[PDB]
Amino acid sequence: MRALIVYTELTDKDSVISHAVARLASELNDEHVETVIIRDFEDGLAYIRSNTSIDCLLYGRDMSDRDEQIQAHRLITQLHRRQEDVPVFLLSDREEALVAFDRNMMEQVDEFAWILEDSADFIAGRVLAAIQRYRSQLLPPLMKSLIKYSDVHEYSWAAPGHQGGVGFTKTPAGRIYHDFFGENLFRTDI
Amino acid sequence: MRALIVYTELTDKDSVISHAVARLASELNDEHVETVIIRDFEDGLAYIRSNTSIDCLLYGRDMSDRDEQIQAHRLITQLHRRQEDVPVFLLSDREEALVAFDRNMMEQVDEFAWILEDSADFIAGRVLAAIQRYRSQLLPPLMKSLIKYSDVHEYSWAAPGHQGGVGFTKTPAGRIYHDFFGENLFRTDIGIERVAVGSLLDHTGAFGECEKNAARIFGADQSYSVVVGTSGSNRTIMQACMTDDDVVVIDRNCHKSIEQGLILTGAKPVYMIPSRNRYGIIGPIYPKEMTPDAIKFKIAANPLTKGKVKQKPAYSVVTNCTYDGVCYNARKVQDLLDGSLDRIHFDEAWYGYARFNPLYRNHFAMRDEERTENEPTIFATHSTHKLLNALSQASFIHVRNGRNAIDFNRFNQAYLMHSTTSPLYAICASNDIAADMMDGNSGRSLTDEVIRESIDFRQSLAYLYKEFLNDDEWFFKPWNQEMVKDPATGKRYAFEDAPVELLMREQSCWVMHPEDKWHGFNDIPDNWAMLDPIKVSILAPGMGDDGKLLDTGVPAALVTAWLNHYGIVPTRTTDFQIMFLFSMGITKGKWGTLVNTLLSFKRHYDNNTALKKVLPEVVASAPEIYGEMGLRDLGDKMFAYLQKNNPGARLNQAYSQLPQVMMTPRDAYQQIVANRVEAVPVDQLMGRVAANSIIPYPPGIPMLLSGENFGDENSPHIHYLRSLQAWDSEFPGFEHETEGTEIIDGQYYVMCVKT
Amino acid sequence: MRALIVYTELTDKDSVISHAVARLASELNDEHVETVIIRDFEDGLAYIRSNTSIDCLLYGRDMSDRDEQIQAHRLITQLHRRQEDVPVFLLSDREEALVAFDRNMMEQVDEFAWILEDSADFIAGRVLAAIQRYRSQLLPPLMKSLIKYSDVHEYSWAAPGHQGGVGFTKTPAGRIYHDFFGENLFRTDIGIERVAVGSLLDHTGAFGECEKNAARIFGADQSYSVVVGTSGSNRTIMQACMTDDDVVVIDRNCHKSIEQGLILTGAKPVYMIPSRNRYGIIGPIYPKEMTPDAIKFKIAANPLTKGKVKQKPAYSVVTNCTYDGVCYNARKVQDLLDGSLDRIHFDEAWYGYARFNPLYRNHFAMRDEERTENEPTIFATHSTHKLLNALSQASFIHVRNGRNAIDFNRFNQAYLMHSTTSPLYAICASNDIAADMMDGNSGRSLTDEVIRESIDFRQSLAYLYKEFLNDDEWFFKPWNQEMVKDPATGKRYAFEDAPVELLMREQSCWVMHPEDKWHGFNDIPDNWAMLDPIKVSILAPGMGDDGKLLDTGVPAALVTAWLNHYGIVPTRTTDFQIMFLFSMGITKGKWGTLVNTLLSFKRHYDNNTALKKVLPEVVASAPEIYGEMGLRDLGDKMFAYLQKNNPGARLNQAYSQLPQVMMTPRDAYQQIVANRVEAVPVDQLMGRVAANSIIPYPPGIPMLLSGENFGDENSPHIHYLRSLQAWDSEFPGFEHETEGTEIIDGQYYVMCVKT
């Protein structure tokens, strides 16, 4: 589980937003969510264009700057080109975000996180819930069922005879073969 | 133990103050006091607005800058909103602080720490002493005594038999259970025979202190902690107030525990009928139901009480607020009922926070007022788990003594009759902590948080509604005023354009005015009812402002299914109405999720997405009809059904006529006990007496009670039951609820008295 | 996950088997399976007798030694006493195990592991699969579903408002509360609107599975889980069974919830009078109270029911066992009452374990028998928290349908009338786990442990009694048989000399025989009553075997004060009787502590130690009389008081005559409601009607109920109240309890009906 936090300048004194984002990142790392913190939309865009899985996007911008609004929209569109249903939270001061509320905001924002006036534990819980919801819908049906059933290891009394690859691990060449191709290939040969 | 040090610029060279604060932080960390150092009041304020426990605040400012003086005052006020008695030390140069000394300084400063000329060890010692003093007074009495006694582990030779959870750790499943719920839950299950704690039933020890503290907080003369919920609370109040030879005045909008009390006492009920609007929302009882004339008319017209017209009613019950968030003006309700009654019961099960925010002023039972001697006795039941912070089954009875009051010895018999001899002290401790969380500044702070959250949701939803309207498109709108008026400046506002401080401060922005069209309770007096902001109803399109369906619409059953798919279970629902609850357990900004979900619905409703993708659990009900079909198609089918059959007029006819009463609820229940009852199909209910209550959803309030007649072949009540059954058969998976009926072969049976 | 490997000597050179087991243990530790390796069956047995969860047993023995075969069989049987379905693998050489293959092997072996010729990875995989299979079936249904659903954290938009405990973590005291009780308690407080779990009130989901499982375990047709305790259980059974026009047969040894049910139903009661012994212990109702002749006589002699002699009683209640541990032969009780009754209620609140040990055979309600069609309906209430392992307020109703049964639709109305609409699911989960702990082998194992513990205490105390007797000195003796008789060999035994297996196996060693002098219930039939071994009464010296006080003695009030000083609070106490409770939460050998304490008393009683040293809390009551005084001095003063006033004959006269009945309990309670009542001093109770019940301790059962007359100036009941008051005034700090009286100025007031 990995969350990307892209924020540029949310307070007139960057200390406040920096410490709030630090507390949030600490809570996320406590619930086993790796975090990547980026301070510019260009670097965030370059990070998204690498083939890294991002399970949640938390961004915050100036909220009075149209240039950063366009940059953030471009960021989220780039994110959803290949990672289409990733949750996006808006990190913002409450009032700056409520004066900017409209349909265009909600077409790209999934959640609000008032970072400056809320517990980081609460936001982290909501992030983790959104990540779990996202990952439960990610795989296509057959792959999902095969990955679930590959955890079942017992000896069935029917073919294939290698029985999830157990048959191979009885000669040394068979053990080399089995280690080369890995266990899951043979566990899905059901 | 955690100390927050917020200092900005105390010396002309920041090195001096920085090194002094570093030495102080080192000494505090040596005495086991975690420290958080912040260099700006904005970041300190943001840190305080997280739910972190702060045991001491040490701050220092410029001392020549008025802007930082205001920032520091705001910081300390924010700190004390929820952490009310935290010690505050001033970190300062001696002379700059002594020239600034006055009453205003000492109203917020508790201690001085001359950081630049004193040992850090001395300051740390004084900080630690202040922290210990603060933490010794933090817990409420019962919780404090239970936490102390939970350290006692020895085998007592008496029940409960699990002996602090030791009994569970003897089988493997018991060990899993014990590890899941933890040791402390079982260590506090001690039994009523420990004099170190007291007993609930005797009202002694920490339990007496708890109930006196709760009476202080909630503004009552006496308070009673209940471990059977507001069911038990209502049941014991009714058992104490009325007897078999009494007549009582019952809000027809009553919880089933009220009829349980009627069955257990045997009293003869008279009903005040509430009002409806076009959306099927149950509204307030009008004042013309409560006047002494109306009550004497109702008594004289009742087949059971017409021989009691010379008799004063012994009890009345009013539900405030209603399930849909309608709050009565309880001052005026009390003044009307004081003309006929000595005892008034307010079932405030959903309405326990109301005392702790000025927005609800005069709209609850236990008010801060000058109390006359000629006042009636006032009972108020709170379900502490519904909207306060307590475990299930926790409840309070609050008594404000007046005319014809019930003293303690008489009331305790009814109290014991409906209680247990072995109460679970975790429930009592949750009552204690729930009353504590509302005491002082924290009650106001928490109710403000919830109300601001709900107002944000309301204004955002109204904004989106107008915005889709400019696109000539449909959307969900909140059920509240469209235009508000600032009384001070006289300026008018669209609801979504009004300032949040106006809506949180001004009570008239929530009153139902007889000239406004939003609430739909025609002919309501002014300043009689109010909308509770945190019971947020949203209206699906389809109902017209005059009471007839529009050409097109979206039924709320489909949107409710959509929401249930996503884990969002609404509390209340009608044909076009969905009620969401904002509680003090909600977090800030969560409502955005809800907005998002609604927007998703609209897209999938406009694209007519196949039900197989979006709502497979609905297709799983009747795959032959719900497969092969889309979302907008099912919506249009439901709306055409509503146009053809129009169950709203059915509801109005069933609830505007009260059924004929044949016997008291106790007599009908005793027909059940005597086995003189039988299940009857709906098509055969003519002239049959109901043996139990029938509560259809909607509207969620009882249509018939025990002992009432279903009526003729033309009775509106049988017609409405048929309407519900017809919906249920037409739309599988979207079946209504009806408490009091069995459903055999998709067909309703009512248990009626044998002829 | 933990695997126990018990192997002794499998190869002629232990190196081979040792290295094979080491490789296996290494593989298991690689798949996250902790291992415990033991080289002897005695140490393995001692390890199993600790309460450690073992998920798999892998054992290997010599395979040519019959002694180790027996040791291994004993090991596996001990394992499955409390961990019943744990997988057992045989570790063996192939051929030694295949020559030993037979049915007896496979009755205890689940898997083979040829440890000497197979990969340790393969064996570890099969062990892990068996462990996972075992753990998936370990929890009972409701607990399993709650543990699964507790992982769901999202904000629901409905009550409870604390939202899985999030609401508490917003004030500092709330955070302390939340940390003390832990997260899982609040995560399981979910409300009744989650279809993943079901609802208690509808009996659906995991709640239906739970109640069906409990009906299976406890031997009932239907079971009902109750969150209001046996108070609520009794109250709902009585509400379902009887009406205002009924006559009912009540054990005069009744819990106050029985009279609460009488008040709530209005039925006219007739009382069966229990017996006493010389120690003031309440014993069984004799069969001559239960015959149809006796019941028709009682009905015809009652001022309230003499117009109902042609009417069949609708209900009877019998308390089994009594508070002092006297168990009726419930087969014979049922056969007697089957001649007058269709419904019999057994209030088995203290007696829930009885089904699960053969020592209680035929002495409880839900028996393993061939069931006739002409049997009456049987109700049984268990207080699952008193002697089973459950949280307070947990209870079961058990129904075995017979004549004039109450079907589900009729019973559920009474069930809902006395319940809450928001049950705390922790209580329901505790019922579920308590029923699970008694299922299978573990019920027998746990009841055996408790009974053996209590028998050890009894025999040790009887031994010390005889040993002090040979020294011609006094001591405490247990209240049980002095001589037991083995029926098989006919051999007689002193109780302290009998084999423990005889006393745990043979039921006749606990029956009260009419020729024995220990129990003191003169004229009792044989094979009618039994002593429950785990309710251990000890007798202080001072009462003679004929009913009169001896020349010297030690009153139990002083010994009770001594025990309370040390944290040992007895359940029951009379003049010379102290009852201790052994529960399944007790640990082994704990009773020694109790023995030690008693011995201490004797020393400090013989040395006449000053009360200031040993019992300062007693001197704190009246320092003018209890200072300056010693322990033996106060004991002699108390005993002289008992000799002069003799309250035992007072108790016998007050409880051998029933008071005159003036009205039903409901009519007296309704006089309370009508405010027609008043407090009255004891000296003025002549001819006054009691408005509530009077329950003096001793004997702890009600002396008067509501609506009964105190009587003339010569009434035994007023005399006994005066005796209690006189004791209380003479000996401050040793005051009796009397439920139903107020104590103003150290003087008793009873709330009586106004004339």
Residue numbers in the entry:
A (entry chain F): 1 to 190
B (entry chain D), C (entry chain C): 1 to 755
Sentences from the paper on this structure:
Bacterial homologous lysine and arginine decarboxylases play major roles in the acid stress response, physiology, antibiotic resistance and virulence. Inducible AAT-fold basic amino acid decarboxylases (LAOdcs) have been studied since the early 1940s1,2 because of the link between their enterobacterial pathogenicity in humans and their ability to overcome the aggressive pH environments and oxygen limitation in our gastrointestinal tract. These enzymes decarboxylate either Lysine (LdcI, also called CadA), Arginine (Adc or AdiA) or Ornithine (OdcI or SpeF) into corresponding polyamines while consuming protons and producing CO2, thereby buffering the bacterial cytosol and the extracellular medium to promote bacterial survival under acid stress conditions. Here we show that the Adc from a multidrug-resistant human pathogen Providencia stuartii massively polymerises into filaments whose cryo-EM structure reveals pronounced differences between Adc and LdcI assembly mechanisms. Like all proteobacterial LAOdcs, the P. stuartii Adc monomer is organized in three different structural parts.
In the decameric double ring, two monomers form a C2-symmetric dimer, which represents the basic unit of the structure and forms a decameric assembly through strong inter-ring contacts between adjacent dimers. This type of dimerisation is typical for proteobacterial LAOdcs and for pyridoxal 5′-phosphate (PLP)-dependent enzymes in general, and leads to a completion of the active sites of each monomer buried into a cleft at the dimer interface. The N-terminal wing domain protrudes into the centre of the double ring and is involved in stabilisation of the decamer assembly though inter-dimer contacts (residues 1-139). Preceded by a short linker region (residues 140-192), the central core part contains the covalently-bound PLP cofactor and is composed of a PLP-binding domain (residues 193-439) and an aspartate aminotransferase-like domain (residues 440-608). The C-terminal domain (residues 609-758), located at the decamer periphery, partially constitutes an entry channel into the active site. The Root-Mean-Square Deviation between P. stuartii and E. coli Adc monomers is 0.52 Å (over 4424 atoms), which illustrates their strong overall similarity. At the sequence level, the wing domains of the P. stuartii and the E. coli Adc proteins are the most different (52.14% identity) whereas the PLP-binding domain is the most conserved (77.33% identity). Although the exact residues involved in both dimerisation and decamerisation of the P. stuartii and E. coli Adcs differ, the buried surface area (BSA) and predicted ∆G upon decamerisation is similar for both proteins. In contrast, our Mass Photometry analysis of P. stuartii Adc indicates the presence of the decameric species at pH 5 and 6.5, whereas lower molecular weight species are detected at pH 8 but also unexpectedly at pH 4.
